[PDB]
Write a protein that binds this ligand. Structure first.
Ligand SMILES: Nc1ccn([C@@H]2O[C@H](COP(=O)(O)OP(=O)(O)OP(=O)(O)O)[C@@H](O)[C@H]2O)c(=O)n1
Ligand SMILES: [Mg+2]
Ligand SMILES: [Mg+2]
Ligand SMILES: [Zn+2]
Lengths: 615, 1052, 98, 85, 98
RNA sequence: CCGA
DNA sequence: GCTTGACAAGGCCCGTCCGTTATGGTATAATGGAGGCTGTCACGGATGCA
C-alpha cells in the first residue's frame, strides 16, 4: 500500500503485547514464548511452545496443520480444533511475531549505556550510580522519611544497609535494587512539576549548571509532547522476531545451519524460567539476586552485544551477532541490502578494444546475450509461431538452433544496454549502448569511451545490465546513451576526445619534416588537386606545398598579419607577401587570388574535418 | 644450497629433537592421592607406515599421515607392578619430499612467521616536549610480560601485563632479595633511593601482601604461591633458548643456557640498565630491526600446538586418576588421544599459517614456501598495521626482498626471503659475505654469514663494485653501508663485501634480465606475473636468461634427479630404469597428466635414452613448466613494437594465427567433479541409469551403473553421473492434476538429481574413480558412495586471454590475424605479435627492449645467452654495448646482413602484409619471451537471467558457482541519481531484487508482451521494519487522507 | 546553513537547538507581527559529518552513520520522516523526487 | 521456494487449460472444473457434484469419462501436448 | 613533505570538517596599523590602534608566530600572524563586531 | 590469498 | 440421459504394544576461575581531579 510518513517512538508494554497476541475462536490468546525449544530432533518439526511454534508463528507448510488432518487447500481461514494451528499459507512466518513475559523488570541498554545516557539525565543521577543500581551492586533510598542521615536517591552498600538495620530509624525506610528500583523511581516522577521547576530554576542559576538544566529540560519536554511515560525505558515484555528472519536450515550432510539470534533468545528464556522457578520455591536472596543480574545481562546481549560488559562469544570465540549488529554497520541492513542490491538480468566479462566499430555501440557476446535477453527471446519464439509455451522455448534455447540466433538478432535491435565498470567514481561510470552480437567471449568496447570509464585492456571487466520496462528503455536512450555524454559534468570540457594513438597519428600527419621533401614548392589548384596528387604518389606527406585557397579563415602557429615584402606588378596590381601566405589583390576594392604554404597532411586533416562537420 | 632448506630443517628438527622436549616436559604425572605415577618414554617413540601414499591420498580426499606410538610405563607405589605398553598418542601428517603437507586431499604449506624476539627492550617515549622518560619491556617466549616505567619525577614503576603501576622495590622485596644486594648490585644507588622514600620500603612479608592487593582477604602465602606460579614456575613461564641468549647478550651476563626461568638477578640487571639509561649510557632498541625479529617455522608452531594438546591430555589423565579409587589399571586406559588429534587437526586445517598452496607453476610453488608473513596468531593484526611496519628497514638489505610484496591490502606485511638468505639456529636471518683484507676481496674459503652483526661494527659493500681479477678493489671511493647509513670510504677500510649482485632480491625477481633498466614497480609486476603463468604443452627455454633457472627447477621438485652413477637400461613414457654402479635396479616413476591445486597439468617427460652413463645430479625427467632441466614458463616469439589499426590501443595485444595452429600457448587444464549418494530420511539416494524426463541418446556415454566411461567427450549439459532421490510430498496443483487426468502421465516417486557439466567446461573424461564403503573404503558419514570424475581439456589461445612478459607488461589479446595480413621482414618472415610502443616510456620498463634485441641476436646466432643483472659493474653502457656488438656479429653472417643497420641500430625496415608497402619509419623488431596467464576469458564470462535467492533478504545470490547476480552498489545508485533515470533505478531495486510479486508479474508481462506493472514494497524493507520493532521501537508507517491518520500494514 | 539559539523568549526554541537561519527569520517575522519578544541567535559552522547527522530525517541519518544514537534520539523525540530526499525513497522503494 | 519461471509456466498452463476446456460443452466444462478445483480451489468427490446438480454420481463419472475422452482426441488437442515433461 | 594528493587531501578533509588547526590569530576590529619592533630576539608583539574608540586593542603574540603586516588599512577579519586560519574564529569575529 |  | 446393484479401495477411528522420554535418585569427604593483552590513528564528548 501507499503511506505518507514513518514515525518512530518508544514501545509501551501494551504495544509490544499488541504486536504478539493473537486470539483464537475458542477464546485463547497465543503469542507468548515459554520454552527454549526450537525443533524436534527425531522429526524435524517445530515444538508446540517455543521459538518456532506453529500456534504463534504459523504453519511451516502451505495449507497444512501441525498434527496432520488438514493437509488440503480447501480448509481456508480455519483453526484446527485438536492442535491449534491456523490453516494458512506458510509465508506468515515472515511477519508474525511473538513475545516473552519477563519475571523481573529489565532496562533497555540503549537508554542506559548510550551517549548522552537519557536514563541518568531524566533521573538526575550519575551514570555510574544508575549502572551500579541496575546490576545489583548498590542499593538506593526510595523513601527517605524520618532520617537526617538519609536522603532521596542516595546510594548505599550492603554494609551500610545492614548497619541501617540496627535501628530497624524508627519509621518506614524503603530501599530498592535492580531495575525494580529504577522503574519505581521513574514511575513517581511528575513530568509537569519537574518541567516547571526547571523553568523556575534556569532563570536564577549559574553558567555551567544551566547547560545541564537545559539538557534535562529538553529531555523532559520530549516525554510530554510524545505522551510517553518515563517508565517505558524499563522493559516488562520482550518482543520476539519472526522465525523466518532467524532461519534454521539443514545442510547436505545432516548438520543444521542456525542464526545467532536463537542462542540469545534461548539464554533469555532459560534465565527467565529459572528465575520463576527460584521465586516459586523461595530461594535465598543471594541466589535470586544473581539470577536477576544474569537475566539483565542476557537481555542486554540480545539487544547490543558487548555494549556494557563482556562480549558473549560462540564456538571459536566469535562474538554473536545481535539485533543492533545486524543493522548498525556497513555489513548491516542499510548499506548492504537497502542502498545497494544484487540484481537479476545482469552479467560480466572481460573487455577488449573495439576499433572498426562506432560509438554508442558495444560488442555483446552471443552466449551472454541469450541469457540476458531470455524472456524477450521466449516472447518472440511464441509470437512467431515456432513454439507454443515456455518449456519448448527453453528447450530450443538450450539445445542450440540457428533459428535462435536470428531471433536474438531481431530482438536486441534497438534495445539499449547499460555498461558499468567499478569503481563508479562519477556519473560517466554507467553509460548505455546499442549492442551488436559479436562472436567470442569478451565485450568489445569503443576506444573513445575509455577515459570516461578509466578502462584499459589489460584485465578490466565490466558489468552489463538490461532495462526491462519501456520507461527504462526510453531513459537509457534519451538520457544515458554514450553519444550524448561528450562534456564532463565537473568542468565544461569534453571527455570524449582522441587519446594515445589518434593524438600521435594526427601529430605525425600534420608535422614538419625536412627529410621528406618530394615535389616541394609546387603549385596546386585547390584542396582536391593536392589530394589527388597525394593518392597518385606525386608528393610526400610533409612536403611544402602552395595551395590556391581564397578563404581567409587561416590559423597558423604564431599567427602573422604583417607584410614581409611587396613586389609591384603591372595594371595596378600589388603582390603582398606574408610568412605563410601570398595575396594578390586589386588596386582599389577587390582581392584576386591567394596562395597558402602547407603540407598535404594538413590538407588531409582539414578535409576530414570538413566532411565530418558539414553533412 | 637448497632453497626450501628452512622447511626441511625445521621439520627435521621437530622429528629429531622438538617433540622429545614436549614429551620430556610432559612426564611425569601423578594423582592427588600420591599413589600412581605415569611417565612417557619419549625417546623411543615409533612411527607407523602411512595407509596411503601421496597420489592415493590426493584422490581419496584424505591426509598423508602416520600413526605415532609413545611407549608408556606404569609404576606402582603400593607394590612392584611394572606395566609397559605401546600407546597410540595421535596422528601426525608427514612432510613430503617437496616440503609440503597433504591435508584432506590438498597440498598445503606452512608459511614462515616473523615475530618479535624474546628478550629485554628499551624505548624512549616523551611528553608534549617534557622529560626524556625511558621504559623497559621483558618479553618471554611464553608467559607474562614484565614492564618497567620512569615518569618525569623519576619513579621506577613496574607493572604486570594488564595491571596498574606499582613500585620496583615492592616487586624486588616480594621476590625475597635482601635490601643489601639490591643497592649493592646497582651502579647508581642515588637515583634508586629517590624512589625508595616516596614509595616506601616494605619488609619481605609486607611486600607479599600488597601485590595481592593489586593483582587481585589479603594473604602472603597466597601471593607467594601466585608469584611463584607466574614467573618462577616451569610449564607456565618459558623464557626460551633465544630469550636466555638475548637477555644474556643485552645485559652482559654469563647465566647458564639451561635455565629458562626468570631470576631476580635479571630483574636487578634490567633495573640497572633502565636507571643507567637516565644518565646517558646504554642504547635504546629498535622494534623493526631484524636483530630483534625472528622467524618461526613449522617446528615451533607444531611444538606449541602439541604443548596445548598435551596440557589437555594430562588434565584428562589426572582427573581420571583422581576419580578412580580402584587401582591396577592399564596404561592404555588412562590415555585419551582425542585432544591431541583435535589440536593437530586444528593447526593443519584452520590456521592463518596453514595456507592453500600456490601450485600454478614451479616458480609459484617455490616462492610460496619461502614467504615470510608478519600476520597470524602471536604476530600482527591487519587493523593494527601502520606505515612503519610496512616500511623498508635498512636491516632488510640482503635478508628480505624489497620488491616482491602483495599489491592488495597486505602490502608490506607478507615478505619474501632473499636468494642467499638463511635462518640460523636461533631464528635470525643471516647473509653471506666475502672478507676484504687490505683492499682485496678474499674469496679463498666459505663466507661468514653475518646475522645482522654488520650495522654497528662492519663496513659492508655491495657486490657490484668494480674489481680487477685476482686483485684489489679499483677506485679510491667504495660505497658502503655503516650504522644503517649509506656512505663512501676507501677500499682499505672495507671489512666485508657481498657475494652476488642479486643478493638483495628474491628468486622470481632474479628471473628478470636487465632488471636495473626497469622501474621497481614493474619488477614487482613482472615477478607476480611470472608466478601466474600456465605450463604450456611444448615448453621452451628463454633465449635470454639470468642463470637461476636450473637451480629453481632443481629445487622446485618437478624434476626427476638422479642419485647414483649408472647406466639407463629402460625408458618409456611411465618409467625410467637404471642399474647403479660405482637391489640393483632403481625405478623412477614418471607422473602423467595429474591435476594441480589450480586445475593445471603436472606432467613429466623423459629426457635420457636407453644405454648411456648418468652422473649423480643429472636431470632424467623434466616437469610441466620445465624443459632441458631449466625453468621454461613461456615461448620466444617475434615482436614488432608498432601500432596496428587500433587493435593494440590501450595495452591490447595483436597476435597472429601461427600461435594458434602451431600449438604455441596451448595448455591443459583438468577439472574435478564429485558427487555423493547421500542418505535422506525419505529414502536412500541411488546412482542409476533410469532417470525421468531424459531422452534416448543422452545415455550413450553412461555405463550400466549410470556413470560415464573413460575417454568420452562431454559438453555443457551432458550427464556425468545419473542420480535420483525419493521425493515424497505429492502436493499437485489443479493444472497438473487435470493434465495428468487427460494424458495418462503417471507421476514417479523419484526426481532428477544428476551431476551435469556446467556452462562451458567441455573436454575429455580421463578418470572415473568410484569409492564405495563395501569395497574397502570409508566415506564421510551419511553418504553411500562417492564418484570422482576428472575432465581434461586443451585450451588454445583466444581473444580475451591475458598475456605478459617478464617486465610487468601485461595485456589482453584483442585480435588474431592471418599471417598474410601480419607485417613481415625483408626476408619475408611475418611477425608473431605487435606490441604498442607507447606502453614502454610511460611505464618505464626499458629492459624489455634490451631483452628483445638480445634475444633476436641470439636467434640469428643460435647461442642462448645468459646475463646476470646489474652488469654495469663491468663498464659504462655495458648492456647497450653488449647488445649492439652481438647484433653486429649476427649481421656479419654471409646471408643475414639486413639484421642490423648502423644508421638506426635497434630498428630495421618492416613491410605491410596487406598492401606490400614498407612503413615510413624503421621499427624495432626482436624476440621476446611472452607468458600466458591463468586469467582466461572462459573463467571470467558470466550471465544470469533468474537463479536462486537469499534466505532472509530474498535478493539474488552472488558468485559464478551459484548463478549469481551483479551487485548494484551505492556508487551505482549515486550515478543513476546524478542522471535522471528514476524508472531504471526503481526497476533495479524492486522487480529485479526482493519483491517477489513484482518478479513474477514482470516475468509474466515480458513473456506475454504486455506492460510491466507498478512494483510494491521491497522485501528487505519489511525485514528492517520487523527488526526495528524487535529492538523495541514503535516504528510504523502512516497515511493521511481527508483529515484522517491511519497506521498502514506493510506486510499486507 | 544552521544557527544556534540563545535567549529563548516567547518561542518554542530552547537554547542549544540548531535551526536554519531562514526558519528563525520566518518565526521572528511571523511573531513580530504580534509585537512579541523575538529570539536571539549566534551563527555556527558545522562540518560535513555534523550537518549530515543534524538533518530533519532520521532514516537518512540512521543509514549514514551512528545508527544506535540516531535511532535513540529519534525514538525519544518521537519524530516523523516525511520522505523528502533521494536516500529515503531508495530505501522505501519509490520513485526518487529528482 | 518456487522460482518465477515455474510461476509463469503454471499460470500460462492455467490460461491455456481454461481456453481449451471452454471449447467443449458447457456442462462437462464446469464438471471438470468443479472436479479438480479449477474455480473453487477445492477438489470434490463424485457425489457432491450430484448435490451441486441433483442427478446422482453415476452420470457424473460417465460425464467426466467422456470429457476426458474428448480431450484425449489426437486432432485439435495437441496445444496442451507440449507441456508433457 | 612530498607534493601530491596524499598530502593535499587531509587539508581538504580538515577544511570540510571545519576543524580547528594548531596556530591562528586574527584581528577583532578594523584599525589603522603602524608597526613597532624594538628587538626580534624571540619576542615580538604587534601594536595596532583603532580610529573610533579610545581604548585600543593589541593582540599578544607568542614567539613561534611571525608577522605579515607591513602597514596597510586593516579591516575586521584580517590575519596578522602566520598560520592556518580557522573559520570558526572568522565567523565569531565578524558576528561579534557587527 | 589473487585480479581490476 | 439416467438408474440400481455388485466388487472392491481406502481414509477416520478406537483398542493394544513396545520403543522413547521425562523424572527422580546415588550418603567417606570434597567448600572463591581460567585465561588472554602488551605495534593503529584521529577526533569528540564526558568525566575527574587538582
Ligand atoms: N586497490 C585498487 C586497485 C585498482 N583499482 C582500480 O583499478 C585500476 C588499476 O589500473 P591498472 O590497469 O591495474 O594499472 P594502471 O593504472 O593502468 O597502470 P599500468 O598501466 O602501469 O598497469 C585503477 O584505475 C583503479 O580504478 C581500484 O579501484 N582499487
Ligand atoms: Mg587496467
Ligand atoms: Mg593499466
Ligand atoms: Zn491439527
Amino acid at each position: 500500500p501507499r503511506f505518507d510518513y514513518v514515525k518512530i517512538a518508544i514501545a509501551s508494554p501494551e504495544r509490544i503485547r499488541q504486536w504478539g497476541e493473537r486470539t483464537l475462536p475458542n477464546g485463547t490468546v497465543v503469542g507468548e514464548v515459554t520454552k527454549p525449544e526450537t525443533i524436534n530432533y527425531r522429526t524435524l518439526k517445530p515444538e508446540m511452545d517455543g521459538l518456532f511454534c506453529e500456534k504463534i508463528f504459523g504453519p511451516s507448510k502451505d495449507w497444512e496443520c501441525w498434527c496432520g488432518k488438514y493437509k488440503r487447500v480447501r480448509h481456508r481461514g480455519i483453526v484446527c480444533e485438536r492442535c491449534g494451528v491456523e490453516v494458512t499459507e506458510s509465508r506468515v512466518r515472515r511477519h508474525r511475531m511473538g513475545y516473552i513475559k519477563l519475571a523481573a523488570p529489565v532496562t533497555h541498554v540503549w537508554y542506559l549505556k548510550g551517549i548522552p545516557s537519557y536514563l541518568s539525565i531524566l533521573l538526575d543521577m550519575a551514570l555510574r550510580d544508575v549502572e551500579q543500581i541496575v546490576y545489583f551492586n548498590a542499593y538506593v533510598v526510595l523513601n527517605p522519611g524520618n532520617a537526617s542521615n538519609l536522603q532521596y536517591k542516595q546510594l548505599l552498600t550492603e554494609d551500610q544497609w545492614v548497619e541501617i538495620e540496627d535501628q530497624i530509624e524508627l519509621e518506614g525506610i524503603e530501599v530498592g535494587i535492580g531495575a525494580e528500583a529504577v522503574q519505581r523511581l521513574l514511575a513517581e516522577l511528575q513530568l509537569e512539576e519537574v518541567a516547571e521547576k526547571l523553568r523556575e530554576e534556569i532563570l536564577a542559576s549559574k553558567g555551567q549548571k544551566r547547560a545541564k538544566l537545559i539538557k534535562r529540560l529538553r529531555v523532559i519536554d520530549n516525554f510530554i509532547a510524545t505522551h510517553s511515560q518515563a517508565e517505558w525505558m524499563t522493559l516488562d515484555v520482550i518482543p520476539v522476531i519472526p522465525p523466518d528472519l532467524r532461519p534454521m536450515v539443514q545442510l547436505d550432510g545432516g548438520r543444521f545451519a542456525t542464526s545467532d539470534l536463537n542462542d540469545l533468545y534461548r539464554r533469555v528464556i532459560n534465565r527467565n524460567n529459572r528465575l520463576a522457578r527460584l521465586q516459586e520455591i523461595l530461594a535465598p536472596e543471594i541466589i535470586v539476586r544473581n539470577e536477576k543480574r544474569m537475566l539483565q545481562e542476557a537481555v542486554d546481549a540480545l539487544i547490543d552485544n558487548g555494549r556494557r560488559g563482556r562480549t558473549v562469544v560462540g564456538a571459536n570465540n566469535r562474538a554473536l551477532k545481535s539485533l543492533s549488529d545486524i543493522i548498525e554497520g556497513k555489513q548491516g541492513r542499510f548499506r548492504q541490502n537497502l542502498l545497494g542490491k544484487r540484481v537479476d538480468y545482469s552479467g560480466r566479462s572481460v573487455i577488449v578494444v573495439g576499433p572498426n566499430l562506432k560509438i554508442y555501440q558495444c560488442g555483446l557476446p552471443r552466449e551472454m546475450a541469450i541469457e540476458l535477453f531470455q524472456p524477450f527471446v521466449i516472447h518472440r519464439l511464441i509470437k512467431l509461431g515456432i513454439v507454443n509455451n515456455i518449456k519448448a522455448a527453453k528447450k530450443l534455447i538450450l539445445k542450440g538452433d540457428p533459428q535462435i540466433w536470428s531471433v536474438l538478432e531481431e530482438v536486441i535491435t534497438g534495445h539499449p544496454v547499460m555498461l558499468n565498470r567499478a569503481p563508479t567514481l562519477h556519473r560517466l561510470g554507467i553509460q548505455a549502448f546499442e549492442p551488436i552480437l559479436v562472436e567470442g567471449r569478451a565485450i568489445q568496447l569503443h576506444p573513445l569511451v575509455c577515459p570516461a570509464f578509466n578502462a584499459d585492456f589489460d584485465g578490466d571487466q565490466m558489468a552489463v545490465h538490461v532495462p526491462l520496462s519501456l520507461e527504462a528503455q526510453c531513459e537509457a536512450r534519451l538520457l544515458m546513451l554514450a553519444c550524448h555524454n561528450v562534456l564532463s559534468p565537473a568542468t565544461g570540457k569534453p571527455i570524449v576526445a582522441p587519446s594515445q594513438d589518434m593524438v600521435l597519428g594526427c601529430y605525425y600527419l600534420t608535422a614538419e619534416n625536412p627529410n621528406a621533401q618530394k615535389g616541394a614548392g609546387r603549385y596546386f589548384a585547390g584542396i582536391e588537386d593536392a589530394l589527388r596528387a597525394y593518392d597518385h604518389g606525386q608528393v610526400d606527406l610533409h612536403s611544402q606545398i602552395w595551395i590556391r585557397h581564397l578563404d581567409e579563415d587561416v590559423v597558423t602557429e604564431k599567427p602573422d598579419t604583417e607584410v614581409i615584402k611587396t613586389e609591384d606588378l603591372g595594371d595596378g596590381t600589388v603582390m603582398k607577401y606574408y610568412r605563410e601566405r601570398k595575396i594578390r589583390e586589386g588596386v582599389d576594392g577587390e582581392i584576386i587570388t591567394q596562395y597558402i604554404q602547407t603540407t598535404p597532411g594538413r590538407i588531409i586533416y582539414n578535409k576530414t574535418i570538413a566532411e565530418a562537420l558539414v553533412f | 644450497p637448497d632453497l626450501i632448506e628452512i622447511q626441511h630443517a625445521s621439520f627435521h628438527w621437530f622429528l629429531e629433537e622438538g617433540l622429545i622436549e614436549e614429551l620430556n616436559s610432559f612426564s611425569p604425572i601423578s594423582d592427588y592421592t600420591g599413589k600412581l605415577e605415569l611417565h612417557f618414554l619419549g625417546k623411543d617413540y615409533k612411527l607407523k607406515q602411512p595407509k596411503y601414499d601421496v597420489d592415493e591420498s590426493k584422490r581419496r580426499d584424505a591426509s598423508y599421515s602416520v600413526q605415532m606410538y609413545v611407549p608408556t610405563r606404569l609404576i606402582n607405589k603400593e607394590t612392584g607392578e611394572i606395566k609397559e605398553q605401546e600407546v597410540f598418542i595421535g596422528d601426525l601428517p608427514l612432510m613430503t619430499e617437496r616440503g609440503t603437507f597433504i591435508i584432506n586431499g590438498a597440498e598445503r604449506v606452512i608459511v614462515n612467521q616473523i615475530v618479535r624476539s624474546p628478550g629485554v627492550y628499551y624505548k624512549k617515549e616523551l611528553d608534549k616536549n617534557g622529560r626524556r622518560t625511558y621504559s623497559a619491556s621483558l618479553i618471554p617466549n611464553r608467559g607474562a610480560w614484565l614492564k618497567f616505567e620512569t615518569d618525569k619525577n623519576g619513579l621506577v614503576y613496574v607493572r604486570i601485563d594488564k595491571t596498574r603501576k606499582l613500585s620496583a622495590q615492592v616487586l624486588l622485596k616480594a621476590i625475597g632479595l635482601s635490601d643489601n644486594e639490591i643497592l649493592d648490585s646497582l651502579s647508581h644507588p642515588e637515583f634508586y633511593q629517590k624512589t625508595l622514600d616516596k614509595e616506601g620500603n616494605p619488609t619481605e612479608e609486607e611486600a607479599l601482601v600488597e601485590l595481592y592487593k593489586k593483582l587481585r582477604p589479603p594473604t602472603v602465602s597466597g601471593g607467594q604461591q601466585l608469584l611463584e606460579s607466574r614467573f618462577f614456575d616451569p610449564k607456565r613461564y618459558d623464557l626460551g633458548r633465544v630469550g636466555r641468549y638475548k637477555l644474556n647478550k643485552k645485559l652482559r651476563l654469563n647465566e647458564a643456557d639451561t635455565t629458562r626461568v626468570l631470576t631476580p638477578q635479571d630483574i636487578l640487571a634490567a633495573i640497572n640498565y633502565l636507571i643507567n639509561l637516565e644518565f646517558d649510557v646504554g642504547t635504546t632498541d629498535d622494534i623493526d630491526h631484524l636483530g630483534n625479529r625472528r622467524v618461526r617455522s613449522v617446528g615451533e608452531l607444531l611444538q606449541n600446538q602439541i604443548r596445548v594438546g598435551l596440557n589437555r591430555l594430562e588434565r584428562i589423565i589426572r582427573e581420571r586418576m583422581t576419580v578412580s579409587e580402584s587401582d591396577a589399571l592399564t596404561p592404555a586406559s588412562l590415555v585419551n588421544p582425542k585432544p591431541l588429534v583435535a589440536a593437530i587437526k586444528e593447526f593443519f586445517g584452520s590456521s592463518q599459517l596453514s595456507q592453500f598452496m600456490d601450485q600454478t607453476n614451479p616458480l609459484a610453488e617455490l616462492t610460496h614456501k619461502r614467504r615470510i608473513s608478519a600476520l597470524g596468531p602471536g604476530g600482527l593484526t591487519r587493523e593494527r598495521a601502520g606505515f612503519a611496519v610496512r616500511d623498508i628497514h635498512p636491516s632488510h638489505h640482503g635478508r628480505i626482498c624489497p620488491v616482491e610484496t602483495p599489491e592488495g591490502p597486505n602490502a608490506g606485511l607478507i615478505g619474501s626471503l632473499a636468494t642467499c638468505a638463511r635462518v640460523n639456529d636461533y631464528g635470525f636471518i643471516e647473509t653471506p659475505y666475502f672478507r676484504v683484507e687490505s683492499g682485496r676481496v678474499r674469496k679463498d674459503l666459505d663466507p661468514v654469514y653475518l646475522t645482522a652483526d654488520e650495522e654497528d661494527d662492519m663496513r659492508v659493500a655491495p657486490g657490484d663494485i668494480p674489481t680487477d681479477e685476482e686483485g684489489n678493489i679499483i677506485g679510491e671511493s667504495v660505497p658502503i653501508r655503516y650504522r644503517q647509513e649509506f656512505s663512501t670510504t676507501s677500499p682499505e677500510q672495507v671489512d666485508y663485501v657481498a657475494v652476488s649482485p642479486v643478493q638483495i632480491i628474491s628468486v622470481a625477481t632474479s628471473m628478470i634480465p636487465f632488471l636495473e633498466h626497469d622501474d621497481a614497480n614493474r619488477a614487482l609486476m613482472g615477478s607476480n606475473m611470472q608466478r601466474q603463468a600456465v605450463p604450456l604443452l611444448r615448453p621452451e627455454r628463454p633465449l635470454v636468461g639470468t642463470g637461476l633457472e636450473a637451480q629453481a627447477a632443481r629445487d622446485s621438485g618437478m624434476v626427476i634427479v638422479s642419485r647414483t652413477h649408472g647406466i639407463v637400461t629402460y625408458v618409456d613414457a611411465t618409467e625410467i630404469r637404471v642399474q647403479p654402479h660405482s637391489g640393483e635396479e632403481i625405478v623412477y616413476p614418471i607422473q602423467k597428466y595429474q591435476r594441480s591445486n589450480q586445475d593445471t597439468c603436472l606432467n613429466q617427460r623423459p629426457l635420457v635414452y636407453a644405454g648411456e652413463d648418468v652422473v649423480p645430479g643429472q636431470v632424467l625427467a623434466d616437469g610441466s613448466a620445465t624443459e632441458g632441466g631449466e625453468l621454461a614458463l613461456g615461448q620466444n616469439i617475434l615482436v614488432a613494437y608498432m601500432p596496428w589499426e587500433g587493435y593494440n590501443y590501450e595495452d591490447a595485444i595483436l597476435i597472429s594465427e601461427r600461435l594458434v595452429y602451431d600449438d604455441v600457448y596451448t595448455s591443459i587444464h583438468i577439472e574435478k567433479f564429485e558427487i555423493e549418494a547421500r542418505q535422506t530420511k525419505l529414502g536412500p539416494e541411488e546412482i542409476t541409469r533410469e532417470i525421468p524426463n531424459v531422452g534416448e541418446d543422452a545415455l550413450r556415454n553412461l555405463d550400466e551403473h549410470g556413470i560415464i566411461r573413460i575417454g568420452a567427450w562431454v559438453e555443457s549439459g551432458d550427464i556425468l553421473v545419473g542420480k535420483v532421490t525419493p521425493k515424497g510430498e505429492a502436493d499437485q496443483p489443479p493444472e497438473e492434476k487435470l493434465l495428468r487426468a487427460i494424458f495418462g502421465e503417471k507421476a514417479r516417486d523419484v526426481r532428477d538429481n544428476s551431476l551435469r557439466v556446467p556452462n562451458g567446461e567441455k573436454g575429455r573424461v580421463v578418470d572415473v574413480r568410484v569409492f564405495t564403503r563395501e569395497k574397502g573404503d570409508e566415506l564421510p558419514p551419511g553418504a553411500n558412495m562417492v564418484v570422482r570424475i576428472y575432465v581434461a581439456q586443451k585450451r588454445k589461445i583466444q581473444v580475451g586471454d591475458k598475456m605478459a612478459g617478464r617486465h610487468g607488461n601485461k595485456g589482453i589479446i584483442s585480435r588474431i590475424l592471418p599471417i598474410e595480413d601480419m607485417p613481415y621482414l625483408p626476408d619475408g618472415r611475418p611477425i608473431d605479435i605487435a606490441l604498442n610502443p607507447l606502453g614502454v616510456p610511460s611505464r618505464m620498463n626499458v629492459g624489455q627492449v634490451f631483452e628483445c634485441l638480445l634475444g633476436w641476436a641470439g636467434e640469428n646466432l643460435g647461442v642462448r645467452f645468459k646475463i646476470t643483472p646489474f652488469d654495469e659493474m663491468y663498464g659504462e653502457e655495458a648492456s647497450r654495448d653488449t647488445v649492439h656488438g652481438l647484433l653486429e656479429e649476427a649481421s656479419q653472417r654471409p646471408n643475414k646482413d639486413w639484421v642490423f643497420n648502423e644508421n638506426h641500430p635497434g630498428k630495421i625496415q618492416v613491410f605491410d602484409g596487406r598492401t606490400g608497402e614498407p612503413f615510413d619509419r624503421p621499427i624495432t623488431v626482436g624476440q621476446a619471451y611472452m607468458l600466458k596467464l591463468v586469467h582466461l576469458v572462459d573463467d571470467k564470462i558470466h550471465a544470469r537471467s533468474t537463479g536462486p535467492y537469499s534466505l532472509v533478504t530474498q535478493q539474488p545470490l552472488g558468485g559464478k558457482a551459484q548463478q549469481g547476480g551483479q551487485r548494484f552498489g551505492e556508487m551505482e545508485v549515486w550515478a543513476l541519481e546524478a542522471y535522471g533515470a528514476a524508472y531504471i533505478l526503481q526497476e533495479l531495486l524492486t522487480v529485479k531484487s526482493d519483491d517477489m510479486q513484482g518478479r513474477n508479474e514482470a516475468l509474466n508481462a515480458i513473456v506475454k508482451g504486455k506492460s510491466i506493472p507498478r512494483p510494491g514494497t521491497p522485501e528487505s524493507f519489511k525485514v528492517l521494519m520487523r527488526e526495528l520493532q524487535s529492538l523495541g521501537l514503535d516504528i510504523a508507517a502512516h497515511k493521511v487522507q481527508l483529515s484522517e491518520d491511519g497506521e498502514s500494514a506493510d506486510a499486507e | 546553513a544552521k544557527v544556534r539559539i540563545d535567549d529563548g523568549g516567547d518561542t518554542t526554541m530552547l537554547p542549544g537547538e540548531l535551526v536554519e537561519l531562514r526558519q528563525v527569520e520566518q518565526v521572528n517575522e511571523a511573531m513580530g507581527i504580534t509585537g512579541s519578544a523575538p529570539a536571539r541567535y549566534t551563527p555556527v559552522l558545522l562540518g560535513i559529518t555534523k550537518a549530515s547527522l543534524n538533518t530533519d530525517s532520521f532514516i537518512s541519518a540512521a543509514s549514514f552513520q551512528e545508527t544506535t544514537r540516531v535511532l535513540t534520539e529519534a525514538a525519544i523525540e518521537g519524530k516523523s520522516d516525511w520522505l523528502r530526499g533521494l536516500k529515503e525513497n531508495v530505501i522505501i522503494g519509490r520513485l526518487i523526487p529528482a | 521456494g518456487e522460482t518465477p519461471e515455474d510461476e509463469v509456466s503454471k499460470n500460462l498452463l492455467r490460461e491455456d487449460l481454461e481456453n481449451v476446456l471452454d471449447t467443449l460443452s458447457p456442462r462437462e466444462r464446469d464438471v471438470l472444473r468443479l472436479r479438480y478445483g479449477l474455480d473453487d480451489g477445492r477438489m470434490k468427490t463424485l457425489e457432491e457434484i450430484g448435490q451441486i446438480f441433483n442427478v446422482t454420481r453415476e452420470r457424473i463419472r460417465q460425464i467426466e469419462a467422456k470429457a476426458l475422452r474428448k480431450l484425449r482426441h489426437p486432432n485439435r488437442n495437441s496445444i496442451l501436448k507440449e507441456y508433457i515433461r | 613533505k612530498t607534493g601530491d594528493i596524499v598530502q593535499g587531501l587531509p587539508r581538504i578533509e580538515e577544511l570540510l570538517e571545519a576543524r580547528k588547526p594548531k596556530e591562528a590569530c586574527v584581528l577583532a576590529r578594523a584599525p589603522g596599523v603602524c608597526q613597532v619592533e624594538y628587538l626580534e630576539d624571540e619576542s615580538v608583539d604587534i601594536k595596532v590602534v583603532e580610529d573610533d574608540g579610545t581604548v585600543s586593542e593589541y593582540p599578544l603574540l607568542p614567539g613561534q608566530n611571525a608577522m605579515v603586516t607591513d602597514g596597510q588599512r586593516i579591516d575586521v577579519g584580517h590575519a596578522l600572524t602566520d598560520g592556518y586560519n580557522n573559520p570558526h574564529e572568522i565567523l565569531d569575529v565578524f558576528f561579534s563586531y557587527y
